[PDB]
Design a protein around this ligand. Structure first.
Ligand SMILES: [K+]
Ligand SMILES: [K+]
Ligand SMILES: [K+]
Ligand SMILES: [Mg+2]
Ligand SMILES: [Mg+2]
Ligand SMILES: [Mg+2]
Ligand SMILES: [Mg+2]
Ligand SMILES: [Mg+2]
Ligand SMILES: [Mg+2]
Ligand SMILES: [Mg+2]
Ligand SMILES: [Mg+2]
Ligand SMILES: [Mg+2]
Ligand SMILES: [Mg+2]
Ligand SMILES: [Mg+2]
Ligand SMILES: [Mg+2]
Ligand SMILES: [Mg+2]
Ligand SMILES: [Mg+2]
Ligand SMILES: [Mg+2]
Ligand SMILES: [Mg+2]
Ligand SMILES: [Mg+2]
Ligand SMILES: [Mg+2]
Ligand SMILES: [Mg+2]
Ligand SMILES: [Mg+2]
Ligand SMILES: [Mg+2]
Ligand SMILES: [Mg+2]
Ligand SMILES: [Mg+2]
Ligand SMILES: [Mg+2]
Ligand SMILES: [Mg+2]
Ligand SMILES: [Mg+2]
Ligand SMILES: [Mg+2]
Ligand SMILES: [Mg+2]
Ligand SMILES: [Mg+2]
Ligand SMILES: [Mg+2]
Ligand SMILES: [Mg+2]
Ligand SMILES: [Mg+2]
Ligand SMILES: [Mg+2]
Ligand SMILES: [Mg+2]
Ligand SMILES: [Mg+2]
Ligand SMILES: [Mg+2]
Ligand SMILES: [Mg+2]
Ligand SMILES: [Mg+2]
Ligand SMILES: [Mg+2]
Ligand SMILES: [Mg+2]
Ligand SMILES: [Mg+2]
Ligand SMILES: [Mg+2]
Ligand SMILES: [Mg+2]
Ligand SMILES: [Mg+2]
Ligand SMILES: [Mg+2]
Ligand SMILES: [Mg+2]
Ligand SMILES: [Mg+2]
Lengths: 101, 88, 73, 119
RNA sequence: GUGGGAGAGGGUGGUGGAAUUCCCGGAGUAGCGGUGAAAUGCGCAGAUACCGGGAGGAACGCCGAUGGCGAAGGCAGCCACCUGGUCCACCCGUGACGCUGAGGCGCGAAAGCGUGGGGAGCAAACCGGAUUAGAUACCCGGGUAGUCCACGCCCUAAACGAUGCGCGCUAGGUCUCUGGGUCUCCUGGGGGCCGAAGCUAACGCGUUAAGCGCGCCGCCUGGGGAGUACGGCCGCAAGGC
């Protein structure tokens, strides 16, 4: 049971129904791997620094969760099946390292 | 890995007395736990030799501590081996 | 000798491990998408080491560029 | 005969030749030139003067299509890059922006023995 | 033991962008390439240069360093998992449990071998073009094994600090990595430079000793013959000891 952070960049051209469906599949996959969510920050469409999937923008989602380690990788795979989901990055949570303090 | 609760469990299980954290029995029990963990890790990932070296070193340390116990008090030596099931 | 300004001294309180803060990591890149050296950023060894990996994460996420183009040559 | 009136200008400058390709704002070429399109045949193409002649010839060919402003793009380190730049700059063609876009790898492929002692 | 720390230490899976090549399309025309100069080569079956899309293999630009890790070989995109070593603080526990190490066992760059796969770039051999008195070369155009992966062999090296391991003792200054602390600085571990005493044939070494000592292992005894012969052991072979 470790604490992780999930960054999900998906198709910004999705309507509200398709976005709701993708987020529903994300929530269902999180439940299926026992990933207890602590908070969420939906940033939404933002301008990329380089085209991803031939699109200059991307819809960003971020979830701080806690889950068993053994299946973390096995979860990321499940999140890459959806074609609308184009970037999935999971990172072990770390305490902030402040500079110029 | 090897969390703190398992470490304290084996320490309290092999402590010669309440408060003992560094007797020969405790050291050998902890080395045995680490050795079994590393052997389970080395069944898979058999191409990992740098950890194989650490396994060799842990085994050598455990053998030297068991040799010391054998020399000093063979009764606790036999008791330790009976509790942990070592030497085959 | 890079006597213009240091990126750290031209900045305030910020997290070095936040890979999502794009507007602050943009300052640590050159005119190209390259990562600035120590003489330009004014960071310490450990600080620069953390900044490198956080910038690489921000690049993979699509927030920072891997490489840009030079203008006014 | 398209009357583009504004486009891009790519300059490929190597140590052996300099070649200029004038394109539309989408990159599709219109005309072009090089040291070989001028009378120069051998090593004389890797000359800054040859690059100047190539740039001026490509510019005059683009004049037939009635082009006035260009965006210059430089690729490659070779003698004659700056000479082609200065040739296009004062040629009737308004140079809007000069950009170096030389393709540098991230240490992907192994060079020939000529370019070794590096990666 | 407890609590902290840094790291390209290792293994497995996944994943990102730049570039090379190739394929498709667009656009476009007479050469590109290459060299001291050239030629082979490729190009009217449309190349080079440009834009877009796709495939594949390999290596990770900046960060990056005189830096870090490892016993050595060696390790450099990113993420996760598994895992080794190590350092510091507390002064908590065991109570000499230590050092070294003939054999043995295991690891061991590259090249090389076997089976299967892969094959973009590079490239022994080889096919050509040049050069040259000749050119079985350097230079140029191609190009196979190989380089890559899995598994199994092979045991070599300028495997280098040309300096075996451990412990103690013997001025300092300066730069740096990493902790701790009353955080001008002190203290501990590691990486460099200059230097006290001393050592050295000298160059140089000098708290990271090549100084002063102690313990244990390895090795040397003029050069060629020769790391050859014979014998043995190991190896599929090349061959190694
Ligand atoms: K080093
Ligand atoms: K073959
Ligand atoms: K400090
Ligand atoms: Mg997908
Ligand atoms: Mg030429
Ligand atoms: Mg590592
Ligand atoms: Mg074509
Ligand atoms: Mg060719
Ligand atoms: Mg060819
Ligand atoms: Mg021909
Ligand atoms: Mg024709
Ligand atoms: Mg091409
Ligand atoms: Mg293309
Ligand atoms: Mg292929
Ligand atoms: Mg560098
Ligand atoms: Mg080290
Ligand atoms: Mg080395
Ligand atoms: Mg005490
Ligand atoms: Mg006592
Ligand atoms: Mg030893
Ligand atoms: Mg031995
Ligand atoms: Mg080997
Ligand atoms: Mg090999
Ligand atoms: Mg082979
Ligand atoms: Mg084969
Ligand atoms: Mg080749
Ligand atoms: Mg060749
Ligand atoms: Mg030849
Ligand atoms: Mg001669
Ligand atoms: Mg002749
Ligand atoms: Mg081929
Ligand atoms: Mg063969
Ligand atoms: Mg050396
Ligand atoms: Mg040596
Ligand atoms: Mg000698
Ligand atoms: Mg030494
Ligand atoms: Mg020191
Ligand atoms: Mg000195
Ligand atoms: Mg003296
Ligand atoms: Mg002297
Ligand atoms: Mg010493
Ligand atoms: Mg002799
Ligand atoms: Mg003799
Ligand atoms: Mg000899
Ligand atoms: Mg030999
Ligand atoms: Mg021999
Ligand atoms: Mg023999
Ligand atoms: Mg035999
Ligand atoms: Mg032979
Ligand atoms: Mg032979």
């Amino acid at each position: 049971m470790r604490r992780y952070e999930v960054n999900i960049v998906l198709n910004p051209n999705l309507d509200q129904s398709q976005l709701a469906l993708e987020k529903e599949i994300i929530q269902r996959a999180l439940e299926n791997y026992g990933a207890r969510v602590e908070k969420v920050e939906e940033l939404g469409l933002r301008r990329l620094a380089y085209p991803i999937a031939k699109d200059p923008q991307g819809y960003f989602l971020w979830y701080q969760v806690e889950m068993p380690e053994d299946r973390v990788n096995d979860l990321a795979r499940e999140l890459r099946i959806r074609d609308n989901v184009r970037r999935v990055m999971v990172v072990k949570s770390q305490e902030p390292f402040l500079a110029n303090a | 890995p090897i969390t703190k609760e398992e470490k304290q469990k084996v320490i309290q299980e092999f402590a010669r007395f309440p408060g003992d954290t560094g007797s020969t029995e405790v050291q050998v029990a902890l080395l045995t736990l680490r050795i079994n963990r590393l052997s389970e890790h080395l069944k898979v990932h058999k191409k990992d030799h740098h950890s194989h070296r650490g396994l060799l070193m842990m085994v050598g340390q455990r053998r030297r501590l068991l040799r010391y116990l054998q020399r000093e008090d063979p009764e606790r030596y036999r008791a330790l081996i009976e509790k942990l099931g070592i030497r085959g | 000798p890079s006597r213009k300004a240091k990126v750290k001294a031209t900045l305030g309180e910020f997290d070095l491990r936040d890979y999502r803060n794009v507007e602050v990591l943009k300052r640590f890149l050159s005119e190209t998408g390259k990562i600035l050296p120590r003489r330009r950023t004014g960071l310490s060894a450990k600080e620069q080491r953390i900044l490198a990996k956080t910038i690489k994460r921000a690049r993979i996420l699509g927030l920072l560029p891997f490489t840009e183009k030079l203008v006014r040559k | 005969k398209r009357q583009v009136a504004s486009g891009r200008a790519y300059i490929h400058a190597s140590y052996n030749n300099t070649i200029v390709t004038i394109t539309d704002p989408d990159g599709n070429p219109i005309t072009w030139s090089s040291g070989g399109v001028i009378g120069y045949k051998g090593s004389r193409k890797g000359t800054p003067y040859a690059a100047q002649l190539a740039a001026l010839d490509a510019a005059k060919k683009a004049m037939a299509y009635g082009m006035q402003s260009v965006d210059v793009i430089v690729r490659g380190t070779g003698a004659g890059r700056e000479q082609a730049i200065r040739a296009l700059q004062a040629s009737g063609l308004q140079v809007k922006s000069i950009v170096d876009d030389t393709p540098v790898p991230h240490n992907g492929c192994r060079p020939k023995k000529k370019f070794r002692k590096a990666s």
